[PDB]
């Protein structure tokens, strides 16, 4: 297995035409950098406070019929580094690397 150094980031809720994007991120960087990287890809970094990162598990479709489509996960503010917990377990869709990190709108 490999870390890759890149993250599969899903932001379809923000930009439907680009639901999946690839960003560069190290495990030791906080969500601010990770969010900023992805958000920068959409060219919306100025509006960062309107978005946060959320960990969505692949199997959350059981929990919520919302599926991976609308995104549902744990709120991860810019000051938190989620990769530590993700890569640690590196498995099991819940709190591991089998879960992906997506972008959600902070405000509702």
Coordinates of C-alpha atoms in Angstrom, one line a residue:
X1 CA 0.0 0.0 0.0
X2 CA 1.0 3.6 -0.5
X3 CA 0.0 6.9 1.0
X4 CA 0.3 8.5 -2.4
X5 CA 0.7 12.0 -1.2
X6 CA -2.5 12.9 -3.0
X7 CA -6.1 12.9 -1.9
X8 CA -9.3 12.0 -3.7
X9 CA -11.4 15.0 -2.9
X10 CA -15.1 15.1 -3.6
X11 CA -16.7 18.6 -3.9
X12 CA -19.7 17.8 -6.2
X13 CA -22.0 19.7 -3.8
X14 CA -20.1 22.8 -4.6
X15 CA -19.2 22.2 -8.2
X16 CA -21.3 19.4 -9.9
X17 CA -19.2 19.6 -13.1
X18 CA -16.1 18.7 -11.0
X19 CA -17.3 16.2 -8.3
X20 CA -13.9 14.7 -7.9
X21 CA -10.6 16.5 -7.7
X22 CA -7.1 15.5 -6.8
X23 CA -5.1 17.5 -4.3
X24 CA -1.6 17.2 -2.8
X25 CA -1.5 16.8 0.9
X26 CA 0.9 15.4 3.5
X27 CA -0.4 13.7 6.7
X28 CA 1.1 16.4 8.9
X29 CA -0.9 19.2 7.3
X30 CA -4.1 20.6 8.8
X31 CA -7.5 20.7 7.1
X32 CA -6.8 24.4 6.3
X33 CA -4.1 23.4 3.9
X34 CA -6.0 20.4 2.6
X35 CA -9.2 22.4 2.2
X36 CA -7.3 25.3 0.8
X37 CA -5.7 23.1 -1.8
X38 CA -9.0 21.6 -3.0
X39 CA -10.8 24.9 -2.7
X40 CA -7.9 26.5 -4.7
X41 CA -8.6 24.0 -7.5
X42 CA -12.1 25.4 -7.7
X43 CA -10.7 28.9 -7.4
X44 CA -12.9 29.6 -4.4
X45 CA -10.2 29.9 -1.6
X46 CA -11.5 33.4 -0.8
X47 CA -14.7 31.8 0.3
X48 CA -13.0 29.2 2.5
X49 CA -15.0 30.1 5.7
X50 CA -18.1 28.9 3.9
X51 CA -16.6 25.4 3.6
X52 CA -15.1 22.7 5.8
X53 CA -13.9 19.2 5.4
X54 CA -15.9 16.2 6.3
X55 CA -14.9 12.5 6.5
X56 CA -17.3 10.4 4.6
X57 CA -17.2 6.7 5.0
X58 CA -17.8 4.6 2.0
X59 CA -20.4 2.5 3.9
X60 CA -22.3 5.6 5.3
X61 CA -25.1 4.7 2.8
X62 CA -26.5 2.3 5.4
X63 CA -26.6 5.1 8.0
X64 CA -28.1 7.6 5.8
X65 CA -29.9 7.1 2.5
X66 CA -28.2 10.3 1.5
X67 CA -25.4 8.1 0.2
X68 CA -22.0 9.5 -0.8
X69 CA -24.0 11.8 -3.2
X70 CA -24.9 14.7 -0.8
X71 CA -22.0 13.9 1.5
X72 CA -22.4 13.2 5.2
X73 CA -19.6 13.0 7.7
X74 CA -17.9 14.3 10.7
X75 CA -17.2 18.1 10.7
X76 CA -13.5 18.7 10.4
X77 CA -12.5 22.3 10.8
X78 CA -9.3 23.8 9.1
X79 CA -7.4 23.6 12.4
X80 CA -7.7 19.8 12.6
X81 CA -5.4 17.3 10.8
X82 CA -7.8 14.4 9.9
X83 CA -5.1 12.3 8.0
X84 CA -3.6 11.2 11.3
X85 CA -6.6 9.2 12.2
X86 CA -7.4 8.2 8.6
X87 CA -4.0 6.7 7.7
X88 CA -3.6 5.3 11.3
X89 CA -6.4 2.7 11.0
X90 CA -6.0 2.8 7.2
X91 CA -9.1 0.6 6.9
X92 CA -12.7 0.1 7.8
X93 CA -15.1 2.7 6.5
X94 CA -15.7 4.7 9.7
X95 CA -12.5 6.1 11.1
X96 CA -9.8 5.1 8.7
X97 CA -8.3 5.5 5.3
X98 CA -11.2 3.6 3.8
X99 CA -13.1 6.8 4.4
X100 CA -12.5 9.8 2.2
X101 CA -12.3 13.4 2.9
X102 CA -14.8 15.6 1.2
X103 CA -15.8 19.3 1.3
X104 CA -19.1 20.4 2.9
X105 CA -20.6 23.7 3.5
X106 CA -19.9 24.8 7.0
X107 CA -23.1 26.9 7.2
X108 CA -26.5 25.4 6.6

